[PDB]
């Protein structure tokens, strides 16, 4: 049969937003303006302020999504090819690190708001984008034999969840989906919130988690790594103090949360 046969910064951000979401993993490079610094930080701050306001009002995920999604196109665009939007998102997050690393209360509030925004944006993805984003983060499925041996217990665990979360009222549909569903084994301490609600099957200190659940692990890893980075960002705040022109902006940004 017949057969034939700075740029680096732009490539870096194209790589970082190929998945459409990021753990905000790497040091930015090059330059932006100070007006851009202030405005981008304030835009992300406004979105996170509304997220914290809705959570203090005890609104659900669907209501918060209805409230926040129109604001991305104005303040912080998502699901976009634009280099400007991608840099805006990345730099705004990194600025609010320096604003909110200063104290435990600020770190907790920033981690909570940013993790909830991470959850919202993850919900906006297609399943293919979610799979690719999870795989890019380098994030144990059980064998078919182990699934067969534990099939009764796993099906008893997930059958109600399949009906209520995936709307599979028919038992026939639930059985077919369960036949097609994969499960993850890990220590029970890692998914303890699902353990307290009895949403996972426990055996010998290991929790058995279906594939259609487990986003709390992703968001918890995001929150934990963000907290560790904020603790690190706190430790080298004395290097931030070499430029006086940034401190009034950060004080202004933090004043809205105090």
């Amino acid at each position: 049969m017949f057969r034939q046969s700075s740029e680096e910064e732009k490539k870096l951000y194209a790589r970082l937003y190929e998945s459409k979401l990021s753990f905000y993993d790497l040091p930015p490079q090059g330059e932006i303006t100070l007006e851009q610094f202030e405005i981008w930080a304030i835009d992300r701050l406004k979105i996170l302020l509304e997220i914290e306001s809705c959570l203090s009002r005890n609104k659900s995920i669907k209501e918060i999504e209805t409230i926040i999604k129109p604001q991305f196109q104005k303040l912080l665009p998502f699901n976009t090819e634009s280099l400007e939007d991608r840099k805006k998102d990345y730099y705004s997050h990194f600025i609010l690190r320096l604003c909110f690393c200063r104290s435990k209360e600020l770190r907790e509030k920033f981690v909570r708001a940013e993790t909830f925004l991470f959850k919202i944006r993850f919900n906006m993805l297609t399943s293919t984008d979610q799979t690719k984003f999870v795989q890019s983060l380098d994030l144990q499925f059980i064998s078919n034999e182990e699934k067969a041996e534990l099939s009764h217990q796993l099906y008893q665990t997930v059958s109600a969840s399949l009906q209520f979360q995936l709307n599979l009222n028919e038992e026939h549909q639930r059985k077919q989906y369960f036949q097609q569903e994969k499960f993850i084994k890990l220590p029970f301490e890692n998914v303890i919130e699902l353990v307290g609600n009895r949403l996972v099957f426990l055996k010998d200190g290991y929790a058995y988690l279906p594939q259609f659940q487990q986003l709390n692990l992703l968001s918890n890893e995001f929150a934990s790594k963000l907290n560790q980075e904020l603790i690190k960002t706190y430790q080298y705040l004395p290097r931030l103090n070499e430029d006086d022109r940034l401190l009034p902006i950060l004080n202004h940004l933090s004043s809205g949360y105090t």
Binding site: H152, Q153, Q156, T157, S159, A160, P187, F188, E189, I192, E193, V195, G196, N197, R198, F201, L202, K203, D204, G205, Y206
Partner: protein, 391 residues
Amino acid sequence: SSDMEYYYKSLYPFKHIFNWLNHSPKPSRDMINREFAMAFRSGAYKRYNSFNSVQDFKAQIEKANPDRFEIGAIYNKPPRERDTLLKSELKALEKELVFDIDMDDYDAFRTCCSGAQVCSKCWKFISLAMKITNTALREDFGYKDFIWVFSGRRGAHCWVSDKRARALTDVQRRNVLDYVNVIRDRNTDKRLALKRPYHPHLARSLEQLKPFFVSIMLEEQNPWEDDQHAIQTLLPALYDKQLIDSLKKYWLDNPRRSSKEKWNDIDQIATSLFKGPKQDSHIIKLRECKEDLVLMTLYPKLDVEVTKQTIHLLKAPFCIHPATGNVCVPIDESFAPEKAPKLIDLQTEMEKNNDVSLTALQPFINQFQAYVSSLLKNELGSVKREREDDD
């Protein structure tokens, strides 16, 4: 006060308790930084005691001579040096995952005794609760290093000392408690909130408790022989209003039918009422209500305050109960409170023999020694496995 001094100087097993709490024959932070609290006959209560060694532990408890002392969390720094620290600088690192069961929580269905009084007839509640809890700890969580302890008058305390169990955070402890807490509302005027089909924990617990429902609830205790108590506790667990009204009317016309008779009357009247194509669904719902009643009556009942915080303090093993005089001995599922030793009896036996091994306390000390030996062996094995994994 003199009896307690004699007890600490002659009878208390300080060495085995030190090995349990220290997790090592030689001293470590698990004892140096562990908080202990002492309660006194004057009404005083002193927190933030900690001990450098078994000799220091024994000497300080003997010198203070409290009515009892309580065990707390392992800290980052010695609690006895709290005067050198700000309150925010002394922080917890570990504590044994502890569960507390009280007999008084079963007075909704107990009849032979009420309140803090106990007897072997009602302790089958605690025995079944211990059995279900042990099944959960071994099969679900994979724990092995745990032991049950009699509270002295009315309850049982399980002290889980597995390294993964000791390291649980407050959030993790609360979620574990929620996992094992099934009857989350003690009020009797509703059916349980449990979803269907059962989680495997609930199904296994129900199958373990089914053989004992008749003999204990319907026959031994027999709480529903009183018609008003049945109307207030048994009927609200049922799913249908017409069934409840029919049973209420029938029992008011035919009073003082026993719990077994009422349990059969439910089936008979439901069969009489729910004829037709929907009969199978009504039978299934009735069976669901009876299964939920078994769980409502016999499942473990727990004090959340003991488990929901790492820093909590609880009465230590082998303490003396101030009112009853019983020793807070280790126990197993075959225990009853009548088998516990007492301080006065142990003093008499020591006066007669002058040897702890010839007293009634020595089988319980043997149980605790075997538990400590197994705990230390598993700790050393865990350290070896961790070192091999690091290598």
